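Figure caption, in words: inputs first, then the predicted bound structure.
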Amino acid sequence: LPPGWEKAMSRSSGRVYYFNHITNASQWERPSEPARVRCSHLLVKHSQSRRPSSWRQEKITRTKEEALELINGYIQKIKSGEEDFESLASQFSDCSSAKARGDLGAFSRGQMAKPFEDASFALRTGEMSGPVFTDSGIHIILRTE
Ligand SMILES: O=C(N[C@H](Cc1nc2ccccc2[nH]1)C(=O)O)c1cc2ccccc2s1
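Bound structure (4D9 present):
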């Protein structure tokens, strides 16, 4: 199995799914490296985020736990089709890339914080990460190219 994928078993179901420790993604189907990628993301800052401040809110005061409850709620809407990544990124992302629908443009290794970079490079085109953690907050990353 490819970059950082692993067999896991469902607690509710008893069915084998697959989990990516690098991207924190999980899917049911058995999964199937480039020089540059392009990613969008939705960032939710928390009180130990680097700059606890954003265009949404001048002091960010939510805790690491509450940030992850948000990221998990957003992930549910996105995965359920009830809203899409872009619309949620524009509305809710604490990153100023919110206005470009979360788009960060194309990049290569060396450019971005490493947790984010590894997740970016381990995603497949069109694939969405689970929650990924950097000193900035907790990201949901969507690899577009
Ligand atoms: O790194 C940035 N600044 C942070 C948010 C952030 N933190 C990151 C950590 C890793 C990768 C991208 C990231 N973006 C902020 O706005 O507080 C960027 C802002 C913008 C705005 C427009 C285009 C690219 C970028 S990259």
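Residues 39 and 143 are 4 Å apart (CA to CA).
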